[PDB]
Amino acid sequence: PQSDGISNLHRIALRFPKEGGGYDMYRFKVNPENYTIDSPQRTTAIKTKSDIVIEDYGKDIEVINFTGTTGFRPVREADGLKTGKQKMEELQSRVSEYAMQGGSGNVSGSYLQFFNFTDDSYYKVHLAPQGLKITRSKDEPLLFRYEITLVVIGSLTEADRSAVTTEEFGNVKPNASQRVDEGIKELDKNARKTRDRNNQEISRRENTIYNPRQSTNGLKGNIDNMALIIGYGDGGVS
Template sequence: MTTPTSQKSDQRPIGFTLLQNGQIVPGGQLTLIIRPEELSRDEPSRLSVQQTIGGAYLDHYGVGISTISIQGNTGWRAGIAEDGGQHFQRLRASIFHRWHELREEQQGRGDPDRVEMIFTDTLDEIAVVVAPQSFRLQRSKTKPLLYQYAMKMVVLRDAAVPPVPVAEFERRSAGRVGSAAMEALATSMITRAALAAEVRTLFDPATRVLADLVDGSAAILGAVMGLTQAGIDAFDAVSAPVIFASRQVELATRNLVQALIEPLALTERIKRTLREVYSNAAEAYCNLTNSFQPNGQYLDFTGLFGASNCSSTTGGRPLSDFAGENPFLSLYPSRSAPVMLSLDAQSAINEATQDVLILQTRSPQSLMDLVRRISAGIVVEPVA
């Protein structure tokens, strides 16, 4: 950024532009005649610091949401065509309120994000798409002729960067799982299989059913891995229930193992193995809960919209590319879920996912019965 030769508004303009469907809205442009007295842009980091015995532990998630605040006045005689009061009213009505009105209108037609407000400041080299968070009028007896304003905006993206393109029927709600989460899940699955084999060798026949639960939970983790590695959207109608089932089974495994460690009066070696199972299940549960999440965006069905009757010949919307077809079959392909839980297993999981303190009030026999019911109700088939 070079030092400007002048900071006057006529040479370094600052203002707003409203766009709808990529076109400038009539009356939706305003250049501030007087530059704001104050302008600030906050760019936070998304991080969380945890204090531990060994020092500070940092969770870093990149750059946060930026905000821009401007504060100033519209002058007494803003320009030849309008005075300061009229310029203020245009800023408030034609920009701030008009943005809200256009988005409400657009929401009834489809995607409200097709209405955008662009804030441009040539002095500070800022050109961003913003959402107005607040607008304030301030009058003062020390400046009775001036309309003072304060405006706060949330920065959505740089105006030079186009929005993420959405192809017709692209799954905007489909979460894509990062490589780190996939590696952690694979590690949990491999470790779980080894722990299941160790549990079978250490336990007596009465308590060896715990190995069945460890095996079953590992098999569900494998199904989750298979779905994501096969390129299937992580949150469609088939895979989402599998991920949810895996999450619940992991939580039940963690709680039951924790509640059974002490009441069973086990040897230290067996306790150590069970603690490893507990730690493994807890880590897998956290991974499934935190990393395997949808991004919360909506589906875009724009490609479905087509002409009504003869409107395509009179300047209306053209015929849909999907006319005469059922595009939802491609959006939601018919597949069977590779994981099934019996009703009895689901009921047992609901009991096992209660608070551990509640589970610890139950007898070991009652807890082992929950383990048997869950283990017997897990059915995992290969991912197609």
């Protein structure tokens, strides 16, 4: 939304991760003075004698940077009456909780959700290397200005890398190999030595998603158990 044709725009909001489970959010009472989004490309162009070679390697980090202030008037809140100074102090404390115990200790959240209701865009962001920058100036005796840069981990609509489920059709665990190893553990020293010798003998004369349906990947695994339990040689083969 904006102020045009549609009803009143919604300010920009920031969602942080609660230590104790759940989530806490932060909405800006005053929209930022500047809002820049850099979306470079990782591509290099090098001309040869009589041709041009273009190579590309994907999308570059989309860097988000914006500058805003806090109003001097108070305004209603979800709990309490917080003025601009308290608002900016809470922002500082939140950033410091996300940054100071990030490399040390542990933070529950792995990332930050950045909501642009005004621009109708969403992304998952992490603190940039430039980081937060607060400054107060002569010609703003009562106000407080903030400058933050961010790097986009990715689109918020997609799911987390660690929370992805593969196809995983059929059995995933080869139980044949598991029981082969379990049975080999009980074998005597001579049995294991003979299995090594047999393996060498077969080896030196060669050249001259587990599912038994619609696949042949788990072939030798079933043979290994059957050869151990039945007994091809003193130990087995393969």
